[PDB]
Write the structure tokens for this entry.
Amino acid sequence: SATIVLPYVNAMAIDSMVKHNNWGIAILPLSPLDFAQESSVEIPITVTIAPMCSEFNGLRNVTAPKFQ
Amino acid sequence: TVMWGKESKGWWWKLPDALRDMGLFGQNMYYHYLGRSGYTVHVQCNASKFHQGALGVFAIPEYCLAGD
Amino acid sequence: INYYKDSASNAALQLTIGNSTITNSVVAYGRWPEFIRDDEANDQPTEPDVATCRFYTLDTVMWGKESKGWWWKLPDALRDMGLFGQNMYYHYLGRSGYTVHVQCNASKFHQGALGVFAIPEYCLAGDSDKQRYTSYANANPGEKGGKFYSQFNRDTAVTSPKREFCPVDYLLGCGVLLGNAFVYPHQIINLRTNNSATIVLPYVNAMAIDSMVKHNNWGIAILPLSPLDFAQESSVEIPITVTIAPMCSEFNGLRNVTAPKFQ
Amino acid sequence: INYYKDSASNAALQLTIGNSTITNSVVAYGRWPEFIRDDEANDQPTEPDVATCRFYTLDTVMWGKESKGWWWKLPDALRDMGLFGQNMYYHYLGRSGYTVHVQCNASKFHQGALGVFAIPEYCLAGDSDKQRYTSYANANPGEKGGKFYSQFNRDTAVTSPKREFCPVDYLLGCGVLLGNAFVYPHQIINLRTNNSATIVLPYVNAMAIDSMVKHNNWGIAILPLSPLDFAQESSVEIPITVTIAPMCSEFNGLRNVTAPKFQ
Amino acid sequence: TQDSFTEGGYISMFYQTRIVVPLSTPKSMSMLGFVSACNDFSVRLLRDTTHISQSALPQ
Amino acid sequence: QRRSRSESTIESFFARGACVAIIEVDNEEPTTRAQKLFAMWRITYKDTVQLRRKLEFFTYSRFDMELTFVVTANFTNTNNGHALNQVYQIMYIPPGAPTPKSWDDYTWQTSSNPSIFYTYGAAPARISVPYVGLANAYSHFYDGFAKVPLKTDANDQIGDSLYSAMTVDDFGVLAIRVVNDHNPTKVTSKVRIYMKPKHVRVWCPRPPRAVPYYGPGVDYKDNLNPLSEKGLTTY
Amino acid sequence: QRRSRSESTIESFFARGACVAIIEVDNEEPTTRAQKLFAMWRITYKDTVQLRRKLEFFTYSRFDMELTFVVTANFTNTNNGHALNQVYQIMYIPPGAPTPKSWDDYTWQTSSNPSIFYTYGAAPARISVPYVGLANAYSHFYDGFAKVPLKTDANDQIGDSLYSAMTVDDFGVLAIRVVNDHNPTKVTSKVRIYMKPKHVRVWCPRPPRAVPYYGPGVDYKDNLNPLSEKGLTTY
Ligand SMILES: CCO/N=C/c1ccc(OCC[C@@H](C)CCN2CCN(c3ccncc3)C2=O)cc1
Ligand SMILES: CCO/N=C/c1ccc(OCC[C@@H](C)CCN2CCN(c3ccncc3)C2=O)cc1
Ligand SMILES: N[C@@H](CCC(=O)N[C@@H](CS)C(=O)NCC(=O)O)C(=O)O
């Protein structure tokens, strides 16, 4: 397992969350997966994320982005 | 959950994009003009003593990707 | 001298809330809304401050010569109002007080009187011989509310009963004379003196905190005490508007969202 | 105020013992074995120190896929163990505590779970319509012990009834669900974590000292909570061993030797 | 007793990743469950149980 | 001195024994057909109207209770001899406890359930009970349901429940039987139960009922013209 | 305040009167054939199951006892006149004391044995008894025998004894009779005995019974499928 803690990083103290993404997570296999001498191997990978110290401002009607 | 095999090349996610539909966090995100938050990321992957491999997890601020 | 050990055996202006502003008030039972105290509880509560404690305006209604009255249920009327409804449906237990503002404007040549009553545990009568057969959907109209009637119209359907309320104006919809309804917290809007009414309702219930979906804590009833008239015109209609602000709201029991079936 | 004179009328690691050594423990009811105190007695007691307080090993048993359980009675199981049995049969009254050690070793590729329970006044059910008809010989098997069954097999013999117990695994042989047997002092041996169990039993009885021949103070029950398995083999068998050490034993009432008739 | 006005909730279990075993090892296993009450548990209103019955008195 | 309000207090207003139940129990030779050897009554105060109307002046209440039992027996015929004095057994069955199916089943052992044995001709029986409400106060009126239908429910009957009802079985029941065996002559008896609240606190006063009651709820069916005629300018 | 455990104590758990015996006694003209003029009941709590099950939660117990007697009488016919009020005699016979052979023998003089005389129609009789155990505590369960067979015994019956039995005659018996002479009409009566433990201490808790009792011991014969069906993934 792995654990990381990410603080809020940006050129501004507070910014919109819809049109701007603050962080990116990249997972890559540095070494190929293998098991005994089997031809095919598959294992599950799971990701969990917890927000911390979240603030919001500018209450108004709800935004409905068009995702396809 | 995702699956890791011999031909897997990697995965990537964007935050706070990945949590846009997670409980009241998404509702507050879409009901407010300005937002702020930190994160805690936990990656889980279990195998046996006869398996071998290595995963690299990277957190990148302002992670911009190339087109096609 | 008491012999038995058990005690039972013993012989006997502008008001601003959140990002909303409205431009005398009545406090029910002389008790301002307040949060739960440390000496009474049953986990960490969720207590929104400004995202839910603000004024929401309901649909406007029309008052004419033949209008008999209107009624609403709380917190039912606010089930689809911003984040308040989301918190209501995402939590098992909820608590809140209310501020109710009724607006109705007319001219000096109009005349009429409206009575607004806040009733705790406001139970209404059915419209069929069967007892307590009203359905959940019909008992929770929402922000549209219901209306009163001047007579009891028994439902004659036998195959597909309506299962709806049949309130009667002069019985207050519960079998009690309207004249005594002033025992409840109330306000009177007389067109010749004022044009608005305000009431503050604290949280009232036999339990400190209770579910908001299956139980309604308050009822609001508006009835015309005097008929509307204007000069010598045959038909007169004026708008009536209602605004409600939650106050000191607490939620507990976070879990997946509830999706009631309203028709 | 109480009127009557009588109160009843009033309204309501290595462990070494003796010359034996074995290489966490559970103490029953949090009470270590102890000798009789001067404020409770009924002649000069005989209190062997090392000639009887030592570890005796019983016959090894085999655990497989079809095994259902085993049971033993104390002090019955030690009736033929060195000088302890001689003192038991040469004295009218006896007293003692016990230390029980269960050993079972396997590999990392095996799986299974054993539950060991110490039961005071462990009474078992019969195998016939007649009630309390079990014989003394059948109720005191000795160091060999008995076994459990998955069903009740009524004895059909009418001429020569067997007069034997018929314990049932899921009823604990006494008409109580096995799941609650953990209320008694107990230990769990899980092959993936540990390979041994230890329990310490003090002397429990309604009397300070009692005969050891006609009354058994403790019962030991071992049952497989999970079936035994190994890789993908069809048949698997492993040994289980039991060792018992008397502690703080007293005897009184010296006289000629008792010779019970065991078949 | 069973009553919707005093319902308590629900308990569920799910796999997080999966069970993984090496070769020459059993692929099936068993799990056990236990329940108990904490130190803040209380009861009221003693009453008879439904788990024991009788049909004929001893003769 | 000056006039006082001693008798207008809540305690004085409810310091009276009010009948809430009349129950019939018969003693005769058992037979295949239906009989009244033992009776069961569901505890409540809505069977009668006077105490119900007095209590409905308020929305919430909290009190202890005192119960009194009066028993009256009589014959039915004259040519079947007579009978000796009878003994009556009254048992309180809380929710979840087993209920009798016959006048002489094991359930009458009352190992844990409280019971009263009454001898005919003695003083009326009496007992006291404390506040046994699950919540902090009794709820005379409840505006809600016990179930909420959901969109994912397979059918509409999963979430169907009666309006203004908290629990189906509340406060248990009382089972009354005659312990004595059957005499050759049938004997009928009636038990009347009288209730008196004590140490009473109330909240949220409400206007009193003005039309006849119809069911446990607030429904009204007939007699909806209470007021009588009178002249506007007539003294 | 905070919730308390007052009612979960051992004393409260056993603070109830539980029936343990129903006994029949008849009054009629004596005859050569068998009759029920006097009855004898062996004292125990295993005749009924509720109190037995409650007590079997523990291996050892120590308590005093309170006994209450309720008497109910009735006729059987109608053409033989009537009868006057009867008086019942209840006598406690400890082990070793002589036992009656008739309803009017010398044994009823009760010179040293305690006795109760009860008048029909009065309040139910009551008495209290202290702890009378030979040992330091009562033994609900006994894993042993009273005799041990020996190799030198002439026959196998010398050492034969019932399993899980301490003494054949324990705690004595109760003898109940009707003191009154026989009226021309027969009169039947039933005495119900209710027991309440007091000042209770217990040791070595045990799991409760899960299958119907069968005999004084722990034997089981039928109904060995207590649990019901339910889905693994069904709420
Ligand atoms: C041996 C027999 O003695 N046992 C007697 C007994 C009597 C009363 C007991 O409590 C019954 C419940 C009462 C405290 C009254 C219940 N009330 C108060 C609120 N309430 C009610 C009914 C319907 N709608 C709303 C409130 C009621 O019916 C328990 C035991
Ligand atoms: C004038 C008549 O009044 N005499 C009454 C009386 C009542 C009870 C008396 O004691 C009888 C014995 C009781 C203290 C209860 C005995 N118990 C306690 C343990 N026990 C028992 C039974 C079976 N297996 C294990 C324990 C019992 O049956 C003595 C005299
Ligand atoms: N109905 C049976 C007798 C019933 C009976 O004795 N029931 C027992 C337990 S099975 C009991 O508890 N009776 C209580 C009582 O009726 O006093 C008969 O007379 O054949």
